[PDB]
Amino acid sequence: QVGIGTLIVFIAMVLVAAIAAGVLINTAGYLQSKGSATGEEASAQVSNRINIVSAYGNVXXXXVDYVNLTVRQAAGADNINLXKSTIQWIGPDXATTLTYXXXXXXENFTTXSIKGXXXXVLVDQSDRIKVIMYAXXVXXXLXXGXEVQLTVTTQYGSKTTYWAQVPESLKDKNAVXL
Amino acid sequence: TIQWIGPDXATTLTYXXXXXXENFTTXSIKGXXXXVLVDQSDRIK
Numbered sequence A: 001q002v003g004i005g006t007l008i009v010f011i012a013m014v015l016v017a018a019i020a021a022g023v024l025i026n027t028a029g030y031l032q033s034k035g036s037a038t039g040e041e042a043s044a045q046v047s048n049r050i051n052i053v054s055a056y057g058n059v060x061x062x063x064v065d066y067v068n069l070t071v072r073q074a075a076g077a078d079n080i081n082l083x084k085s086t087i088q089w090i091g092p093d094x095a096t097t098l099t100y101x102x103x104x105x106x107e108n109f110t111t112x113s114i115k116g117x118x119x120x121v122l123v124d125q126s127d128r129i130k131v132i133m134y135a136x137x138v139x140x141x142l143x144x145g146x147e148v149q150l151t152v153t154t155q156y157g158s159k160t161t162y163w164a165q166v167p168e169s170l171k172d173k174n175a176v177x178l
Numbered sequence B: 001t002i003q004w005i006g007p008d009x010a011t012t013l014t015y016x017x018x019x020x021x022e023n024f025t026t027x028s029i030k031g032x033x034x035x036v037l038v039d040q041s042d043r044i045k
């Protein structure tokens, strides 16, 4: 008679094992997608960085009105999107964060393609894109020897900072190099 | 790319095939290719 009872408990442990078995696999399924994505973005956090080749600027009257930075992919950088990037401005007067706009809209920035196909995305290593920012709209133009702190923040998080240094004298200079 | 911060203009020049406008052209001085510096003795104008 004992054998009959064994079968039901036999079955009960069968599902109980499956219930116990399943949760680990579905859990491991959660981390395996979760961990893999974590490695990619963290790698993109350190690798997908932006490097400024140079930063010139047009000069009107006696004050810098434009600060154009020619940005470039860093070592091993993937397709960097500039439309999903922000620039933090730290100046003598104002101190805001600039987002991307189209065709400079004061508290924003605009990108023109110096070299390449796209005008908002760095695809290959050789493309250079110039980010236009109205210095005569985010602040009262730019005085001589004025110090601007730019922190170009990529989408993933790689922050490249820049110390903009206006020349101490702008005596008859059509365009300077900050 | 070549950046030209001159007395007047201040733009960036890109390669073209025979110069002018806002572009630069490369002719060969010592070597075979007129756009690539293959050798250490390669000289391009």
Ligand SMILES: *[C@@H]1O[C@H](CO)[C@@H](O[C@@H]2O[C@H](C(=O)O)[C@@H](O[C@@H]3O[C@@H](C(=O)O)[C@@H](O)[C@H](OS(=O)(=O)O)[C@H]3O)[C@H](O)[C@H]2O)[C@H](O)[C@H]1O
Pocket: A056, A057, A058, A066, A067, A068, A112, A130, A132
């Ligand atoms: C940052 O990069 C931007 C990229 O557009 C550059 O923009 C240009 O600035 C010119 C000027 O320095 O303000 C401006 O000039 C006017 O338009 C020119 C052209 O028709 O586009 C031209 O007529 C005259 O300028 S110039 O060619 O004699 O220098 C002028 O009427 C451009 O329209 C503008 O796109 C910034 O200069 C640079 O700092």
Ligand SMILES: *[C@@H]1O[C@H](CO)[C@@H](O[C@@H]2O[C@H](C(=O)O)[C@@H](O[C@@H]3O[C@@H](C(=O)O)[C@@H](O)[C@H](OS(=O)(=O)O)[C@H]3O)[C@H](O)[C@H]2O)[C@H](O)[C@H]1O
Pocket: A081, A082, A083, A084, A121
């Ligand atoms: C660099 O990052 C920019 C971020 O703006 C991206 O281009 C923009 O993508 C928008 C979207 O995220 O796809 C796209 O949006 C348009 O309008 C949407 C909606 O009506 O608001 C929708 O119709 C379309 O997008 S989507 O919903 O299918 O995703 C689209 O027509 C913007 O027009 C586009 O500039 C770049 O692609 C990237 O390289």
Ligand SMILES: *[C@@H]1O[C@H](CO)[C@@H](O[C@@H]2O[C@H](C(=O)O)[C@@H](O[C@@H]3O[C@@H](C(=O)O)[C@@H](O)[C@H](OS(=O)(=O)O)[C@H]3O)[C@H](O)[C@H]2O)[C@H](O)[C@H]1O
Pocket: A143, A144, A168, A169, A170, A171
């Ligand atoms: C050689 O050094 C002189 C130093 O005087 C410099 O010219 C002077 O620069 C002043 C300033 O440092 O820019 C400028 O100041 C004026 O008054 C300011 C304020 O109201 O006091 C301000 O309005 C203006 O300057 S600024 O704040 O935009 O920088 C300005 O109207 C003097 O008028 C100017 O002679 C030379 O430029 C330098 O080559």
